[PDB]
């Protein structure tokens, strides 16, 4: 608020310290609309829906299968299927490994089929093991967190700390009138 | 409840009722009680491991141990109260120089 914030504007810096975005809602429903509009925002929820990430070797191939439940999605509203998580793994990075193959089975497992200095298979398995539990699933990638806040009246207004303002304004649940 | 029991025709209550210098906070801090010397927004941190002064036990979040004076300036401060006031004084004293 003080003298390092007036200089934050007079210098017109490209990156700033602690941004907020104040968005409003449409209806007057606290819990359900709060959870679904908050759940349409944050990213990298893969460390809460998987319970483990394991890698096994079956005699010519490798399984990096992930156990996605349905109980976490039941509590807080995330309108996604396992196909949406497969699309999220399909664009998990820009260009690292994620090109060739994924699979979809009945009880929600996605094992990345891989094919070959020497013996780079174990190195790819360790790097893809250590780069997987921070892969985003559903939400916006350039927003840290979100807090819904109560005013003096019975109104609920969410607020994020990101940088978009275009993909945040283009979001179902909120109105693009004022933010 | 100190300003209401304070008699009229005295200097600091008149100077708080009129203008130039002195408020109700200064006369309540001289007479009644000094309260909650804060630094950097929150209360005072742990100067040692798990505590601030070595005169209080570990994991003691009591007000007399973590930066709440209770004596006014007329009665006199205790040495942990004196150190807690000295920290908050030197904070505002170094932000001017």
């Amino acid at each position: 608020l003080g003298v390092p914030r007036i200089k934050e504007i007079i210098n017109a810096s490209k990156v700033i310290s602690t941004p907020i975005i104040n968005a409003v809602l449409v209806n007057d429903n606290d819990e359900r609309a709060a959870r679904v509009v908050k759940g349409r925002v944050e990213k990298t929820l893969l460390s809460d829906v998987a319970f483990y990430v394991q890698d096994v070797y079956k005699d010519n191939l490798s399984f990096i299968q992930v156990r996605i439940d349905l109980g976490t999605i039941d509590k807080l509203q995330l309108e996604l299927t396992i196909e949406d998580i497969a699309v999220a793994i399909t664009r998990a990075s820009k260009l690292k490994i994620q090109a060739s193959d994924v699979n979809i089975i009945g009880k929600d497992r996605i094992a990345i089929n891989v094919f070959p200095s020497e013996n780079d298979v174990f190195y790819r398995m360790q790097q893809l093991r250590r780069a997987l539990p921070d892969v985003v699933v559903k939400g916006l990638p350039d927003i840290s967190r979100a807090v819904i806040n109560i005013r003096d009246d019975g109104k609920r207004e969410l607020l994020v700390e990101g940088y978009g303002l275009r993909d945040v304004m283009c979001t179902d649940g909120v109105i693009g009138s004022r933010t | 409840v100190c300003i209401n029991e304070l008699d009229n025709w005295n200097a600091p209550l008149i100077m708080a009722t009129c203008g130039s210098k002195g408020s109700t906070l200064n006369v309540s801090q001289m007479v009644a009680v000094v309260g909650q010397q804060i630094i950097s927004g929150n209360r005072v941190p742990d100067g040692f491991q798990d505590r601030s002064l070595p005169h209080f036990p570990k994991n003691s979040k009591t007000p007399q141990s973590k930066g709440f004076v209770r004596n006014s300036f007329f009665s006199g401060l205790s040495p942990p109260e004196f150190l807690f006031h000295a920290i908050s004084g030197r904070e505002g004293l170094v932000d001017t120089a």
Binding site: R130 | V44, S52, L53, P54, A86, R90, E91, V94, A97
Partner: protein
């Protein structure tokens, strides 16, 4: 002048020559102002007369040297090799336990604090200066890049600081200013002696902590590089080294890194075959690995217990070490000029030519005090504004300057930390007397009942712990630190005695019978899982 002035000449006691191998000068004795059975320097100049004559107040240093010839004759002779400034009221001045009539006879006030030099007529004071703790481990954190660990080496000949930075992904690799593009620590402490991968995993992570998956990245890049011990491993650390030393340059196949992993670089440990240094770098790893999982377990630079106060005795010892190393170098190059040109061997003049080379050990020793520039060529800690002229505004001004501690800043742009009042200086430093201006909080003062200590021996304390029950580090398994608290002697690990409460109680009970108790102290630490014994003084109490 009683202990360290003899210790300096015991490291440069003998000189050589390139003319012949049968030439040596041997320093036997040294003392300040003492010649024969008479009194200690029968008449000096008084300290009041030299403040009016614009003189200095000094006593001569008398050394005794051995003098030889090819006729193998050996005798002794006392010579004067220069003046050394005497401080007021300390064991060499006239004003030591003087009577009140003696103070008025010599025109001196009996109530001045003393302790100040009187050089070139004017009164100079060497200030007390704080710095960080030498030979001890400090850990700092950062939000942007990552957590950085430092370890300042307190070696004599060189100034080292072995940094332990990380960049990304837990790719831990230590750095140095005498090493090129650096190497991850698996290869580094694999070159030190820890060769198994089972005990590079248990030593720094524990049994069932969350520390295992954090450190296990650095195992994965073990096979990415020169793995499979020292036919490849130590050679890769030796290949990326600075200070190539082209004199005998052929060593850089096996032996250029055995120079680097020993007393030349990175530390002050004098091990031949490395078990402690292989652990000390490995125990330096665990304090970072614990700080990655929990960012609360970090150290603060502003803590008073992390700092040491350097007094007026250490700086004069450094200056006299430098001017005595320069004294032998300017004299060796001036005595080989004369002992080569004629055919005969010169009997005299090898002792009678020292008076033209003893005027720079006197003028420089006064110049570095009167000016304030403690410029040492080998040491590289050039600081200005050390000595300050004694304030004589009033009586409380000349006394409050002899109590003053002046700290040094890094840069004056974004400091914000070492100007607030720390709660850890309760009764140690003055909580009121600070200057108002640019030096607000950077300049401090001592309280009444304090004492700055000295390093005593460091030798019998280590032999006393082994009596009390601790094992040596070469007798314990590498998979044993889920035990009780591990004893540290000035940062160096000793071997983790069981039941540390009884050890602390018996060590404090031995302290109260006589273990002389200026600084040799003990304190436990639960979050570090250790128990420290401190002997290396330079620290308040």
């Amino acid at each position: 002048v009683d202990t360290d002035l003899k210790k300096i000449i015991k490291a440069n006691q003998l000189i050589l020559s390139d003319v012949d191998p049968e030439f040596y000068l041997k320093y036997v004795d040294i003392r300040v102002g003492k010649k024969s059975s008479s009194s200690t320097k029968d008449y000096l100049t008084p300290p009041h007369e030299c403040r009016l004559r614009d003189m200095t107040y000094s006593a001569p240093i008398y050394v005794d040297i051995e003098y030889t010839r090819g006729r193998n004759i050996i005798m002794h002779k006392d010579v004067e090799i220069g003046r050394m400034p005497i401080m007021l009221r300390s064991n060499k001045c006239i004003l030591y336990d003087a009577d009140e009539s003696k103070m008025a006879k010599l025109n001196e006030c009996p109530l001045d604090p003393g302790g100040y030099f009187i050089v070139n007529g004017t009164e100079k004071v060497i200030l007390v200066q704080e710095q960080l703790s030498k030979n001890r481990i400090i850990v700092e954190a950062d939000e942007k890049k990552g957590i950085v660990q430092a370890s300042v080496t307190s070696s004599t000949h060189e100034r080292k600081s072995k940094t332990y930075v990380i960049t990304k992904n837990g790719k831990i690799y230590l750095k140095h200013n005498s090493i090129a593009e650096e190497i991850p620590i698996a290869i580094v402490l694999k070159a030190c002696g820890i060769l198994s991968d089972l005990e590079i995993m248990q030593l720094v992570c524990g049994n069932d902590s969350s520390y295992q998956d954090i450190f296990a990245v650095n195992l994965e890049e073990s096979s990415k590089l020169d793995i499979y011990t020292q036919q490849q491993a130590l050679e890769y650390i030796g290949a990326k080294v600075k200070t190539m030393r082209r004199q005998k340059l052929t060593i850089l196949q096996e032996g250029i890194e055995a120079i680097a992993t020993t007393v030349i670089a990175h530390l002050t440990v004098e091990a031949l075959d490395f078990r402690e240094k292989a652990l000390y770098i490995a125990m330096m790893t665990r304090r970072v690995v614990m700080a990655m999982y929990n960012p609360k377990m970090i150290d603060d630079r502003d803590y008073v217990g992390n700092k040491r106060l350097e007094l007026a005795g250490q700086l004069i010892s450094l200056l006299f070490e430098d001017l005595f190393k320069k004294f032998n170098n300017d004299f060796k190059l001036s005595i080989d000029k004369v002992l080569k040109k004629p055919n005969r061997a010169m009997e005299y003049d090898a002792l009678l030519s020292i008076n033209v080379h003893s005027n720079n050990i006197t003028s420089g020793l006064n110049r570095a005090i009167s000016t304030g520039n403690w410029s040492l060529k080998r040491f590289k800690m050039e600081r200005a504004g050390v000595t300050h002229v004694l304030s004589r505004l009033s009586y409380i001004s000349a006394l409050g300057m002899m109590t003053r501690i002046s700290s040094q800043f890094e840069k004056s742009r974004k400091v914000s930390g070492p100007r607030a009042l720390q709660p850890s200086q309760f009764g140690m430093l003055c909580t009121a007397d600070t200057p108002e201006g640019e030096a607000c909080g950077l300049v401090k003062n001592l309280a009444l009942m304090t004492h700055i200590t000295t390093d005593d021996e460091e030798e019998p304390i280590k032999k006393l712990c082994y009596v009390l029950g601790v094992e040596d580090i070469t007798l314990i398994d590498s998979a044993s630190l889920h035990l009780n608290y591990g004893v540290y002697l000035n940062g160096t690990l000793i071997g983790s005695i069981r039941f540390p409460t009884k050890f602390v109680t018996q060590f404090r009970h031995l302290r109260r019978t006589g273990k002389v108790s200026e600084f040799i102290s003990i304190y436990s630490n639960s979050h570090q899982m250790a128990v420290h014994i401190a002997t290396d003084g330079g620290r308040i109490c």
